[PDB]
């Protein structure tokens, strides 16, 4: 009855395991990267990674290891799902069609058994004769590997050791033996077993059990030349081979605990290690003891290769390249320069893969431009937490790429008779001007006779009367079309260097000092048309034709624009575009179906104006903060009619339908200059030069989420937007180490120790307190901060540091009571390690004005403040279990008004209108209504169920959305039409779904246009959510008929589209929980419905062999096989 529709907008980006091997071919070195439900296959090249395929599996990738059984050339791929789905994939490409076929599949889940707290472990026999799996305590599941085992039939083997940490398969053994470390009451031990498939049980191990340190956690199987296992904990690294026993206690690995490893040598002579912090060690195996052929060890020295990202799964590619995956940071490709020793850090970064990471809290902001609301997340954690800004920016498809040394301008040029195309591109260096004739993909450059070799030419285009005049600093050189030789050269009257030169269809304008000279274009000749001297320096000028009806003049020292006749100097109109800085460029075209003009300056704002045809100058004063660097204006023919391109530090395209111009983003980090070019290979294309290189191509759909990162070097927790002050308020936490001299020292310079203005909260509203257990040396204290970040520059304007033991939890920007000021409000809580439940909390009200964060009110409460909201000018807070509402008095002091006592912890608060939704981690959804007449709270409904909720959200007055345990989603509903009190006082759980992610935060708003569309949209509303992995979903409501149609379409598609591993979709989306499992209802999968636009036409014809297409009233049972495509496209347009 919920009738919802959940669709992802961004794919998960957190790498949870990567591995290399020959998968696509017997010669390549493939790299496969699992991201959660997405499998990515790359081919490792000399210069980096070349993407090959992006395949989506119906499940959570929990185990991924490659094996090559005898009789095959390319490795297979055993992938296990967190829902216990096992498959053996194999790459299969036929020329151009690529499919991931499944050799064998099955389900390895047992009927009864508690999953191990150490999680699923999947290991493979080195000889590829068995697969070991640890799914439940004291049960080792063995999967025999045979050609006829298409069903993957496994059998259990009993482990007498209940607590087993890590299991691995040893190398170079006759029978398949396993080595593992297990916890027993005596301590920690390492034990070896021998697996017998015929006996279907264990036997005596190769070498007897030993004793390891109390922390020894992970085991590494050394290959055949050495033989044995290596066990590493935090204090010691040991090597066991039966009669051989080596051990070290290096002081380098003491600081952190090694969690991930990799082997870089085929014979296992060197290994890579990665700890929590992100320092990359390197274990070396010394093979100098070849006494009598046996390659035994001599020492176990450990090296340090320098700090890297927070490593979760290392992967050593060839040619000394390491892929350092990261679950909460950015995935990296580093290089082991083992010889360099820059500062002791051998590793140097080569690439970086973006990662939205653990989105902790997000906000949806509306920085002008109408709709297109930006989305700001507090991504990352520890030393790489950052803010990510996400938009909907059109992507640029570059058909070719050519490197340029930062060209100061590119113009088209024809090296042939005029064929309405340009086969030569003329660049402009700092002082030189290199021109290359590129009909196709040519790169050779040869200067022509008509163009000077080095003259710093600015404008070089096709002049009229079969000629071409290039204006240079020294003089303008004119070259005819067919002769291609110099015919005239009309230098400056003062022989000065023209700072700005304008080339038109038949007029050439040169600005020398404060004077200007316009010359009409004559056939193979130069003739002056007018000469004048402006009042001030000419900032910029342009002519927009044959004869330009009007011309523009800019003031460099005054920032004043004037309009004068092109062949004369008669002033027409004047205007001032703010006067902050001198304009950089100006232009005028028919982008908005009218002769609109624009002027761009070096403040990153553009001033628009409305110009008539013959003589008309309007104001149209509007400045938009497009960018943060100086711009450049250009017009590209590959558009609707002309449009306009503004290259900046965020490139923007001026798109207008009939009367509204929008600066749509362009998916590029930075664009320096761009110019249209009709190349023979790519006619009507655009050549854009960036700050480092240049590209040539076109544009595409808006289907792109451009992501800009702003590092903070500390963990960000909460964020809100303040429109009045135009700044973000974000909490952050830096982990600084206690010092023995008295005080604490920061580990690294974060965004709170590098701010403009900093303050320390000295408002000690309370005294005394206790701490008998003194803060010992080496302890790490988490110090909190409130940062006031800008919105278009992203610099920390203010950084307010709270008290000692001040864990700030909530943060809300709102204006309370009748006050006109917008106040920052933070609800903190004192936590001491001695006390369990905090007793003292604070509500502090900051007011960021004039660049200073002054405190207005500091309220003390008996408890902790978990979440805070606003009621039309009242502040509702949740002190521990109570729910308090605060009235803002005229004397700037919070005054309590009413209290509601909940037996649960009021942890999640989500309100709309007068209804209040309260919940806690145990998933106890409670409803409240504030009655203004009585001025007190009332309890409307309840829903109590033991489970781990993660986030809750309001969808409507009746429907309440929320995630819960095992990555599931539920929707509760209240039936106000219920006859009895009990029926309407209990929430009915109507919707269930299995998203596959741990949802952290819910929010309203959408990233797409807010266009009403007259007759509204098929989907009512939009709710975004961000998860731990990094995806961004979108839950929107639907009608009953649309829900039925989409449900039947999904059921029909489930029997047509094949899935890797042959996993049934209904089982994948089933509501999964340790205690019970029920099929999904009330939710429509978005990805599956969107996947209707890529399959082949016969598949569509099979899927659409029924239904009603437009409506049941019109029948249309055939449905024409295309109305459903239109419906799917209209659904896809929501994101």
């Amino acid at each position: 009855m919920s009738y919802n529709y959940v669709v992802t907008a961004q794919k998960p980006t957190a790498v949870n395991g990567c591995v290399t091997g020959h998968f696509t071919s017997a010669e390549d070195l493939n790299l496969l990267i699992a991201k959660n439900t997405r499998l990515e296959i790359y081919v490792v090249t000399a210069e980096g990674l070349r993407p090959v395929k992006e395949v989506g599996m119906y499940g959570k990738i929990a185990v991924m290891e490659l094996f090559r059984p005898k009789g095959e050339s390319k490795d297979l791929l055993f992938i296990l799902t967190a829902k216990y789905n096992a498959c053996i994939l194999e790459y299969k490409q036929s020329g151009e069609s690529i499919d991931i076929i499944t050799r064998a599949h099955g389900n390895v889940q047992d009927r009864i058994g508690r999953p191990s707290e150490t999680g699923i472990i999947g290991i493979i026999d080195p000889e590829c004769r068995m697969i070991g799996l640890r799914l439940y305590d004291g049960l080792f599941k063995v999967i025999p590997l045979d050609r006829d085992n298409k069903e993957l039939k496994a059998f259990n083997i009993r482990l007498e050791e209940l607590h087993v940490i890590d299991v691995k398969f040893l190398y170079g053994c006759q029978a398949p033996t396993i080595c593992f470390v297990y916890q027993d009451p005596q301590g920690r031990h390492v034990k070896t077993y021998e697996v017998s498939l015929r006996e279907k049980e264990f036997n005596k191990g190769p070498w007897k059990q030993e004793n390891v340190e109390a922390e020894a956690s992970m085991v590494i199987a050394v290959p055949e030349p050495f033989g044995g296992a290596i066990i590493i904990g935090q204090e010691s690294i040991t090597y066991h081979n039966g009669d051989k026993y080596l051990a070290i206690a290096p002081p380098i690995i003491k600081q952190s605990t090694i969690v991930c490893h990799n082997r870089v040598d085929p014979n296992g002579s060197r290994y890579l290690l990665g700890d929590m912090e992100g320092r990359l060690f390197m274990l070396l195996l010394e093979k100098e003891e070849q006494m009598d052929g046996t390659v035994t060890l001599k020492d176990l020295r450990v090296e340090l290769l320098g700090e890297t990202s927070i490593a979760e799964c290392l992967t050593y590619l060839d040619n000394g390249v390491v892929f350092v995956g990261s679950r909460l940071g950015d995935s990296q490709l580093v290089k082991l320069n083992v010889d360099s020793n820059e500062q002791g850090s051998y590793v140097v970064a080569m690439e970086t893969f973006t990662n939205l990471g653990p989105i902790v809290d997000m906000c949806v902001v509306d920085l002008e431009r109408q709709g297109q609301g930006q989305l700001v997340t507090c991504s990352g954690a520890f030393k790489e937490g950052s803010l990510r800004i996400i938009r909907n920016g059109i992507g640029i498809h570059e058909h070719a790429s050519i490197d340029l040394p930062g060209i100061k301008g590119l113009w088209p040029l024809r090296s042939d008779p005029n064929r309405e195309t340009d086969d030569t591109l003329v660049l402009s260096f700092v002082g030189q001007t290199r021109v290359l004739m590129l009909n196709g993909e040519e790169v050779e450059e040869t200067e022509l006779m008509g163009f000077v070799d080095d003259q710093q030419t600015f404008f070089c285009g096709n002049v009229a009367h079969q000629q071409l005049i290039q204006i240079t600093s020294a003089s303008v050189r004119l070259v005819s079309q067919e002769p291609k030789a110099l015919v005239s050269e009309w230098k400056e009257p003062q022989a000065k260097n023209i700072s700005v030169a304008s080339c038109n269809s038949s007029q050439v304008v040169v600005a020398v000092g404060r004077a200007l000279y316009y010359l009409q274009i004559h056939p193979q000749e130069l003739r002056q048309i007018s000469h004048t001297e402006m009042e001030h320096e000419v900032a910029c000028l342009d002519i927009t034709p044959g004869l330009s009806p009007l011309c523009a003049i800019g003031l460099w020292t005054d920032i004043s624009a004037r309009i004068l006749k092109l062949p004369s100097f008669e002033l027409l109109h004047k205007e001032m575009l703010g006067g902050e800085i001198i304009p950089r460029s100006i232009l005028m075209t028919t982008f908005e179906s009218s002769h609109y003009l624009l002027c761009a300056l070096g403040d990153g704002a553009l001033f628009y104006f409305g110009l008539n045809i013959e003589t008309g100058l309007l104001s149209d004063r509007k400045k938009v903060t497009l960018g943060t660097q100086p711009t450049v204006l250009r017009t590209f023919r590959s558009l609707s009619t002309t449009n306009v391109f503004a290259c900046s530090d965020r490139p923007t395209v001026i798109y207008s339908s009939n009367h509204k111009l929008v600066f749509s983003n362009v998916n590029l980090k930075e664009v320096n200059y761009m110019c249209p070019l009709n190349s023979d290979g790519y006619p009507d294309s655009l050549a854009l030069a960036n700050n480092s290189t240049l590209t040539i191509g076109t544009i595409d759909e808006i289907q792109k989420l451009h992501i800009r990162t702003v590092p903070l070097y500390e963990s960000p927790r909460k964020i809100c937007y303040q429109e009045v002050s135009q700044c973000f308020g974000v909490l952050s936490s830096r982990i600084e180490v206690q010092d023995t001299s008295g005080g604490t020292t920061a580990l690294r310079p974060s965004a709170s120790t590098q701010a403009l203005s900093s303050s320390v909260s000295s408002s000690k509203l309370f005294s005394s307190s206790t701490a008998p257990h003194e803060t010992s040396f080496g302890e790490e204290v988490e110090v909190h901060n409130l940062l006031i970040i800008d919105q278009h520059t992203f610099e920390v304007l203010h950084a307010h540091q709270f008290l000692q033991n001040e864990y700030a939890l909530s943060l809300v920007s709102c204006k309370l009571g009748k006050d006109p000021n917008t106040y920052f409000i933070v609800g903190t809580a004192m936590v001491y390690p001695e006390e369990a439940e905090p007793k003292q909390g604070r509500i502090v009200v900051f007011q960021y004005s004039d660049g200073k964060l002054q405190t207005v009110a500091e309220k003390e409460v008996k408890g902790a403040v978990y979440s805070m909201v606003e009621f039309n000018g009242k502040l509702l807070a949740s002190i521990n279990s109570t729910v308090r509402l605060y009235e803002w008095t005229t004397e700037k002091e919070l005054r309590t008004e009413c209290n509601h006592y909940n037996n649960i912890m009021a942890l999640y608060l989500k309100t709309k209108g007068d209804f209040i939704l309260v919940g806690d981690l145990m998933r106890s959804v409670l409803l409240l209504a504030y009655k203004p007449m009585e001025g007190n709270f009332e309890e409307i409904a309840r829903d109590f169920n033991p489970n781990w909720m993660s986030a809750v959200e309001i969808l409507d007055d009746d429907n309440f959305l929320g995630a819960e345990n095992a990555f599931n989603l539920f929707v509760c509903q209240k039936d106000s039409a219920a006859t009895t009190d009990e029926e309407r006082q209990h929430l009915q759980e109507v919707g269930l779904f299995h998203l596959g992610e741990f949802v952290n935060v819910f929010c309203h708003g959408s990233l797409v246009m807010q266009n009403l569309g007259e007759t509204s949209t098929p989907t009512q509303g939009s709710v975004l959510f961000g998860t731990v992995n990094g995806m961004i979903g979108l839950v929107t409501s639907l009608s009953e008929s649309w829900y039925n149609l989409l449900l039947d379409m999904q059921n029909r598609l489930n029997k047509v589209i094949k899935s890797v591993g042959k996993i049934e979709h209904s089982f994948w989306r089933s509501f999964h929980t340790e205690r019970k499992t029920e099929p999904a209802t009330g939710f429509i999968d978005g990805d599956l419905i969107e996947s209707f636009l890529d399959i082949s036409r016969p598949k569509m014809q099979e899927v659409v062999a029924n239904l009603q297409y437009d409506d049941g009233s019109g029948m249309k049972r055939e449905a024409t096989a295309d109305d459903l495509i239109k419906v799917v496209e209209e659904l896809t347009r929501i994101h």
């Binding site: 395991g17 707290e117 150490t118 999680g119 607590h163 916890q183 969690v259 799964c313 902790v360």
Partner: protein, 349 residues
């Protein structure tokens, strides 16, 4: 009694109709033995029939005895059953242990005299670890901690537990909530809190007198600690281990008034006035106490502290001594070193 070796386990969420003896009208939490003695011939026949059939019985936890209406109850399996023929009256002695809790869907009375009701076995569900959803795959190997070193010398054991909520809840930084909030929902951390607090009420050996299973531990503490009937019904409502433990702490921190044992009606002191400046519980102030004897300071472990015998007003039992300063410039002047086991805290209403 008759030795019983079989184990009865009714299926969860399965409806069943069973008879309930009317003599018992109290709430019997699971895991608590409820011995009785039936004398009526109808009760003896019903007990014999139950023992031969399934050795099970029902006990509906009535909110009000007079109304005889119960929304929930507990099923009891007869661990020991005996028959006695004395004084010409047959006596059936049953020592049963509660096994499951059921909600009485329908109530009915049989013609024989007993009342047979149909109830559904409520599911006492168990929740997994709160970090199982968000645990990093690479960090799984570091979650099996290093045993549980317990010693009275460590006392608070502050260092070890500070390392628990740093290796068990490392992954809390991936979620919007802090580790100290998750530590309020940790089953073992909760059992930690009840255990140390209960050592402030008694001299029991908590090492073996208390279980390690959260579900079994939660049941007996709810039975052991003294509360009213309505509170006992309230805890019986919860079907989860963690929520039941959470309710227990609230029914265990909202009992401040240190009333006497034996008395169970007079108020000795309050937990607010605890003279922790310098076993025994020291209270800076006290009321409703009678001091007798002489200020004998011999062997007084507390120096400048002379003590005298004490009594409540009527209980007349020794509950401690009001230490008195032996010097003019000595603070506090009078502190009562009452015995921990001599007081039973109750809700300060």
């Amino acid at each position: 009694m008759e030795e019983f070796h079989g184990r009865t386990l009714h299926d969860d969420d399965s409806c069943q109709v069973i008879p309930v003896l009317p003599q018992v009208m109290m709430i019997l939490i699971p895991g608590q033995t409820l011995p009785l003695q039936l004398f009526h011939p109808q009760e003896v026949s019903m007990v014999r029939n139950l023992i031969q059939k399934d050795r099970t019985f029902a006990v509906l936890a009535y909110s009000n005895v007079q109304e005889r209406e119960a929304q929930f109850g507990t099923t009891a399996e007869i661990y020991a059953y005996r028959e006695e023929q004395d004084f010409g009256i047959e006596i059936v002695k049953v020592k049963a242990i509660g096994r499951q809790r059921f909600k009485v869907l329908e109530l009915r009375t049989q013609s024989d005299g007993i009342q047979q009701a149909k109830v559904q076995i409520l599911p006492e569900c168990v929740l997994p670890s709160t970090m199982s959803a968000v645990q990093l795959e690479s960090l799984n190997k570091c979650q099996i901690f290093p045993s549980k070193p317990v010693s009275r010398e460590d006392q608070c054991s502050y260092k070890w537990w500070q390392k628990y909520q740093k290796r068990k809840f490392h992954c809390a930084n991936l979620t919007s909530w802090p580790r100290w909030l998750y530590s309020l929902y940790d089953a073992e951390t909760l059992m930690d809190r009840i255990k140390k607090q209960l050592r402030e009420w008694d001299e029991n050996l908590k090492d073996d007198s208390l279980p390690s299973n959260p579900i079994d531990f939660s049941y007996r503490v709810a039975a052991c600690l003294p509360i009213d009937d309505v509170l006992r019904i309230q805890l019986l409502k919860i079907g989860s281990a963690i929520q039941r433990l959470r309710c227990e702490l609230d029914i265990m921190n909202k009992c401040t008034s240190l009333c006497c044992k034996q008395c169970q009606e007079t108020e000795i002191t309050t937990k607010n006035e605890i003279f922790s400046l310098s076993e025994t519980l020291t209270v800076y102030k006290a009321c409703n106490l009678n001091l007798i004897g002489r200020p004998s300071t011999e062997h007084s472990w507390f120096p400048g502290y002379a003590w005298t015998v004490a009594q409540c007003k009527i209980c007349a039992s020794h509950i401690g001594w009001k230490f008195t300063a032996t010097k003019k410039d000595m603070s506090p002047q009078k502190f009562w070193g009452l015995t921990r086991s001599a007081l039973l805290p109750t809700i300060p209403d």
